[model samples]
Target chain A: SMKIDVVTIFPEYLQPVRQSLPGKAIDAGLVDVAVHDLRRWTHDVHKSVDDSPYGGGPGMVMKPTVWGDALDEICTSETLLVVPTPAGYPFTQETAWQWSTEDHLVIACGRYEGIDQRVADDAATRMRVREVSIGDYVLNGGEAAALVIIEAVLRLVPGVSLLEGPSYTRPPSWRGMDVPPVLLSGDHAKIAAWRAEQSRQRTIERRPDLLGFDS
Target chain B: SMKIDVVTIFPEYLQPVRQSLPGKVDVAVHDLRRWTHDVHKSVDDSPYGGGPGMVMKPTVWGDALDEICTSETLLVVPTPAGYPFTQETAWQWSTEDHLVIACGRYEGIDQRVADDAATRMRVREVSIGDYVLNGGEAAALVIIEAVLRLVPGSLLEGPSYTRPPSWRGMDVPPVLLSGDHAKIAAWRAEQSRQRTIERRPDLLG
Candidate 1:
């Protein structure tokens, strides 16, 4: 089973992770997940997790000291550490494919500008660290992105069928739309060919980048 | 206050939305299943063509949208087929009067609902990134937070630092501690520019 840990200040932001496919995988023993509150590592009276950026910025940057302590307590040599930030490498399907193979994954959720760069740099000494951005846009925090990553990775677990293709049920005709005639045809070969074509066409229309250069 | 409404199947998944700034922004989350007429409360059916996953039924979305959307509503649909969402878009949306976002799952909501809804309301299809998500709840959370921050009075003060300007073998930049307003501003701008160029060059353009 895959082991995943998410460290974030806004653990409440991850409620979705506990109710969906990732939740089901945990129940079935296909994966294990733990959400840690970063404040737990702070020794301050207020349990502060962030401070002003060294230079200056519009938002506070998460202090490295608290993060370092958290990493020391949770990370093992085998952990593949991921930090979600707008300033990081883009997260893609291929990244998910690669992450599914890891025995342990640790995701550090960034907030308030970002985490101290030193924390990521120093953590690389003990584990493989990847700084990933979910998209070109910004988020309030990294908790939502961590949930997205967890959902994607859990789908690759052996028994998860969350990543399914298009499907239809009994009523072939609804409103003005009708089920494609080829699907209703008894020939499995033609149906497979048609589905492949449709998938390709959909990808080209919505996500051309997903198709390889050869295409 | 800018009113924001989100319709989704996983209402519990949106617990965080209730506590976030968007909650104070007049945000409301509606369960799409509530609009279903069936005893099973089903809101999705198989796609018209044979495929692997289910597609959200148009009627459910039509009913829900009819009740939630007004003529002034800016309907936001999160889907892989939409244009990429950016910081600029969030800034623009912050000024809008009302935003009603539809959260689709499985294959997708029937395209017809989006098409027909556009006739009565302004519609914008947006995608957070290139990747696919289990649902739009998380993406909505990202968007709502981004928009809320742009609101006036939403942020108390820009960037804060605590005591002990140095820690763990690292020292705060000398200029920050120097407390020279001119030099600090220049240093902060330069740092922001350098970080943006290194991390997101596309933003520099």
Candidate 2:
């Protein structure tokens, strides 16, 4: 079983990690997860995790010292340090597959402006560190993105995200719309063919970048 | 004051949504099981055309949304095979009066859910990025957080800093500690531009 640890000030947000399939797997002894409160590492009276940005900014940046202590104890050489941030590399299916191979994962969840840049920079010296962005947008913090990464990496059924095709179920006719006639047809071969076509067409329309240059 | 309805199989998965957003936004999370009639309370079934995984039946979503959706609702479905969810999409949603997010699992929600919902309300099927997640809960969390931050007084923006002036053998850039506002502003500008070019080259024109 692989080990995964998440360090965050908002440890409540990581509940889904244990409430979802990862929760089931945790019970089944397929994965191990520990949620750490970053504040545990802070020495200040308020257990402060963030301070004013060094250069004088509008919001506080998470303290690097707090993060350093938390990560040092959780991370091993084989562990992959996953930092979710808008400034990081895009976390794609390929990144998930690569991460799925690791024996341990230390997900450091940052809030506010994010952990001081030095957190990731210095952590890189000891173990693998990946600064990943879930999408081209900003969030309240790294919790959502960390959940995204955890789900993508842990739910890996040996990878290859060819994108799920459109799906349908019974009640072929609903209110005003009908399930695609192609799907209702009894011919599985034609149905499968139609799904491939739909997947190809949808990819072209919605995400051409996912298609390789050869396409 | 925008309202959101998140209908999902694992209602517990959306607990973070309420925890994170709190009362700043009024959110109603509905359990798809409440609409499910089967003995197992199963909201998913084998794909009609045959596939490796189950497909979320349309009726569960239909019944759930029938109660949750409003005429003005922007029905958002989080799917891997949908248009990309970006900053622009979050901006667009921040202005909406109501949003109904249908969280899909298994193979995905039946396509008819979006198709049928589109007749009355705006239906947008969005994927957070080019990756596969277990379900829409994470996407919902990410989407909701991003959108709320864009709203007034909801949350803070992203940034980085060196706090102690010196730490573990590294020093904060001297310019920051110099306390020279003009020099600091110029240094920050140069850093932002250089960092963007290095980390987010796609934003480049």
Candidate 3:
């Protein structure tokens, strides 16, 4: 089965994932998602999974030992690791499209300042690891970004098909705004052309950057 | 008090906002339909350009903004067309008196609403990343999480380490374990710069 394993200190923060579209896919047996507590790998009394940075900082850096153990236990040769961080490679639609084809994904959710860089380096020795950023901004942690990536990927799975252009239901017109007359005209060729044009126009208006990228 | 109001059709999808950084960040999710005067609560219409997706009604958003926006409000519209959101922007937003995040559905919101809102308040169209979403709900979540943590008195504990000197064949650096505060502070500062340099050299400037 396709699988996505998320390791984070704040597993409770990820409860919303089960209520999202990817969660629905999981329930339908399309994918397997397991949220693991990083602290579980700790043998210490405090169950501490993080430590002060090698250099002084405002936030703690995750210790490599705990992350190392968690990755070792969850990953296989086929696993593709995704670490969400402010300083990672840009995550795009193309990235999501590529990841959806993989058999299993392991997302390491770094909280506080960041994870130990050594942990990512060591994991790269065993499996494919890519540190991906959801956007240009930072987050409280990687948990929410993990959900964003999961939703984007699961929807692209084989049977799901990609999402269609904008849609409307029964009431063709509302508040004096009518669904384009061509749509109700029932002309398939015309409808297709209209939809394609609309998609392009919207893309041009909102995201000209995407136009430069190959679709 | 700092405020973040998210306007979206799927208010239910935003339930997770309240659970994150509680007591520090106050979040209010508003249903975009509430401002609609139509019988079906429709907030979108076919684009004038004959696109596949519906464009959100400007009237609906304009009315909603009129009702919610104050003079000090900083309106943030999450869109793929917008400028990249970064840590510097997050820090800037944390200092805002009020933040209103508008979540557009279908193709997007009517451009006029965004333009008109600019006349009354500060508007910043921001893209969370390079990907497109079903709506702005997820992007709003990402932005809120980033901004909330930066607020003063938000994090319960400042960064601290545990007692274990070593674990699973990995040892804490000798300097961190050493009782010399000056060395530990210096080490952390250098490591921070090195990490930033290696991972995000773009930010070093």
Candidate 4:
């Protein structure tokens, strides 16, 4: 079973991770998940993980030191370090497939503008750092994006039957234009053929960069 | 305050929403949210309050339809309808700011792919339409991306807070490239102004 450690301020928001199918799998020892509150690692009186940016910006930036310590304790070489940001690389099926195999995943869900560069730099040395976006949008906290990643990845983990069939087989037909005719035809070979094409096409249109092309 | 109705098989899967700022704003009654489940996730068993046709309306999408639905659903249309989902409309809405989104997805959820035509076929008559998706969870999922951009103080998860002023733009300035504080600072302001103007002209405008 894979292990996931989520570093966040509102750790309770991480509850869905333990309550859904993934959660059920973890509870049954099929997977493992731990949510940590970043605030607990702070040594200062303020316990503040954020500050007004040095350039005198409009929004506060998360402090680097606290995250630094948290990373030191939480991350492992096997950990897939995913940082969710508006400008982060878009999450895709391929990335989800890769990260699912890792023994550990340390997700630093960014809040506000972004996380401290130092924390990112520090963690980058030990693990794979992926700055991912759910899409070309933003969230008050990366928790939502993180949940999306977790849900998608959990479905692919070994022995976890969250999804009934191979998910890639069920790509929305024609970019939501039509459900696959093969799904209706009941021919497994044609169904597989259509699924392979749809997955590639959906990934290209929704996340062209994942294929290293502009589109 | 905005309102959202979430239809999900795993209602508990979204309980974390209660921890969100919008979730808090909801108690002020500005954001009224209803969690819809199909007799399965175990949300309602009521029969009805009015003439008592049925206690709780069945999990029929028809029950979820309403006259002011657009006010709640916020489906924007026009020529850009079938294009890749962009953050532009979201940013505009963030300015005036109030929205609701439905989230769902689970086993038995049908993939009504034809719905894309609502936006693609005729951006004039209709911009959006309803079809089955991975689930309403994915549907409700869109709101988080749309709404967070509107809230002012939600982006503080980083520490450009300590760096010199010159490093704030999309790219650190050349002076910042050289580690020179004064020129770096000057360069940063110019860079931020230039980049923000080019990238998010409307937000800056």
Candidate 5:
């Protein structure tokens, strides 16, 4: 079983994971999930985790010392520390596939401007540190980002299969939108062909699941 | 004021929007189960022909959107098999009057949900990135964060930094401390350009 440790200020933001797949994995004994408040590592009464950047700017950069103390206690030589930042390279399924191979993952969820850049730089020496961006978009916090990264990896603990084509249920014709006729007609081969076409178009037009990697 | 509604089974995942944003516009979070007439509060079916997973019930999704949507509304379906969501798209959506985001898991809602709704309102399917998640709730959170911040005067943006003069042996760039707004602005611009070239050179071209 793999161990996943998530460090965040708002442990609540990451709570929904317990309601979904990761939670089931815990009951199934496939993974161990722990969400820790970054403030736990703080020595001060206010329990501060972020501070001003060296360069005067609009938002607070997560402090290196706070993050340093937090990561130092959790990371082992086998741990892969995943930091989700807009500045990092894109996170794709391939990245998910690569990360799923790890036995331990400690995700640092940064807030405000982001974690001190040096935090990621220094951690790379002791264990694998991947600063990944879920996409080009900016998130309010890495807590939300950590959920998706964990999602993509855990989905593959089983044999890999791409998500399937569109699904149709009961009322085939509803509010004037008809489910595809071939699916309704029920010839197994034609239905399979229709589904394959749907799968192919979705792959190309959407998720493309691009393969080239920069790292 | 912009109107935004997110429909999902995981409403808890979205509760933070109020705590996070000033509620750029008060986002209404709806539970998909609200539309369920099933005995077990069921929202998904194992499907007619099917693989191992369940598909979200069509009527369940349909009724929920019908209750909330309007002719002017833009329906955002957050599926991995949809158009890529980008900042440019975020800026465009920031200007819309209303947006209804449908979030689902497993194999997703019946295709007919989006297809039927497309007949009545502006429908766009969006994917957060090239990966799959347990559900669209996570993507909806990130998507809303990206778009709502773009709402006029909503407070956000930048690589960002705050209140320390020095940390762990690193000091603020010498120019930032010079006290001249002009020099500070120039130094910030150069650092931005420098980092873009270093970390994201693809943007420069």
Candidate 6:
């Protein structure tokens, strides 16, 4: 079983993810997910975590101290921290699988102009840190990105299963799209062959860079 | 102030987007920003809206339904309408400062995906509907991508106002990554270059 601790201002946002897909992991006792409100750690009444940028800018940047404290209290050597941002490395199925293996996963969702770069730096040095992205579009918050990554990655864990029913044969050679005949042939070899083909084609169609990877 | 709405099971999920983004849009209106859970609308437990699909009684989505006017608002109708999202929609949407998104999943939200939009003022029947998604988050993603790129760096919309910084000096410019400076300049020139171009070139004028 793995544990994930999430620190966000809006802890309520964590409910759907916990109740829906990730809830399965919790119910199965395969993972423990906790959401912490960063506001709890603040010194002032307002619990403000942002302010004007150093240089003149249109919007404010999240305060470093606010993030620093929340990050410090929640992190341990075993925790792997993930932050989602437009500039972060693209998230892939492989990355999700990698995370499912970790014992403690802490995801920090940055909103607005994002956390102070230093906070990400200091946190990274203490624990394994990853910046993740889901497709090219920008988002109002990292919560959705966090949820998306959690669902995709949690499914890859060895014991976890796909929701589709068993004996539910994938279509073979359908129009416009074909679930390779191999998958339908009922031969293990054919199924494996078909999966590889489909995965490759899907990657090419959706993510060409991943398709061309030498690894 | 611009009005942007999200039709999500997790209206709570939007809290961070709303709180962290200080003033990107005027979403203080509860009905304008969040979803009215079905439990909030039950009346006589009506046998659903009575279509082949599970009838989602109007009781659930009925609350602020009356308050919404379609003329001035950017009514974003989200669903699996099979409509491919394009940059043009993003560009066009950017033209109006107000937006209302109706995000849904599973055979798409009530047919009102567009009809209900008529209730809002100045509603645009738009969608990020090509690939199916769970719900409003994807729609929010599409809306943000469309709106933010058009924000002119001058309009400080949300909680944090940021321009990419020169951290580590290794910072790669988010703009120059396109390769050719001329192309980059063209993208910047429009102040409204659509984010999802390759997947939706059909809408390109």
Top-down DockQ ranking: 2, 5, 1, 3, 4, 6
lDDT of 6 by residue, B29-97 (tens): 242224344455421121111213232323334444445534666666543332334555566666666
> lDDT tens string, model 3, B65-157?
999998899999887666667778899999997999998862777666776678778999887776666667778888888888788850011
* Per-residue lDDT value at B188 in model 1: 64
lDDT of 1 by residue, B1-205 (tens): 7888999988777767777663356878888888998999988876554555778887778889999999999999887666568888999999998999898873778766777788788998777876666777767877887787787741112222433566566555678777687998876667666666666665545
* Candidate 3 Cα lDDT to native: 0.76
Backbone clashes, candidate 6: 21
Question: What CAPRI-style quality would you assign to candidate 2?
Answer: medium
lDDT of 2: 0.81
Better of 3 and 4 by DockQ: 3
TM-score of chain A in every predicted structure: 0.88, 0.89, 0.87, 0.75, 0.86, 0.77
DockQ-superior candidate, 4 or 5: 5
Candidate 3 per-residue lDDT over residues A140-191, each given as its tens digit: 7898899889877887888651223344333455445555777677777888
Clashes of each: 9, 1, 7, 28, 5, 21
Flag clash pairs in model 1: A52-B160, A52-B161, A165-B52, A165-B53, A166-B51, A166-B52, A166-B53, A167-B47, A168-B46
lDDT of each: 0.76, 0.81, 0.76, 0.53, 0.79, 0.55
Q: Can you write out model 4's per-residue Cα lDDT over A1-215, one digit (the tens) per residue?
A: 78888999989887867655566778789678888999999887978888765544467778777787888888877677888776554466677777768788888887777775666666777777877666555567888777777777777778760112212122234343444455667676776666567556655554454467664
**Among all candidates shown, the one with the greatest lDDT:** 2
Model 2, span A1-215: residue lDDT tens:
68889998888879988767677777778778889999888898989888888767777788888888888888888888988887787788899888887788888887877788888878888988988888888887888888888888878733223556788788778776777888777898898788888888888877777786222
- TM-scores of chain B alone in all candidate structures, in the order given: 0.84, 0.88, 0.78, 0.41, 0.82, 0.55
- The CAPRI class of candidate 5 is acceptable
Query: Which stretches in model 1 have alpha-carbon errors above 4 Å?
Result: A161-215, B154-205
Off by over 4 Å in 6: A161-215, B1-205
- Residue A168, model 5: lDDT of 83
Error of 3 at B187 (Å): 9.5
Q: TM-score for every candidate vs. truth? A: 0.82, 0.92, 0.75, 0.63, 0.85, 0.52
* Candidate with best DockQ: 2
User: Over all chains combined, what TM-score does candidate 3 have?
Assistant: 0.75
lDDT of 2 by residue, B1-205 (tens): 8888888878888877687664466887888899997888988888777768888888888888888998999998988888889888999999998998889884798888788788888999999888777788888988888888787651112246756777888777788878799998877777767767776776664
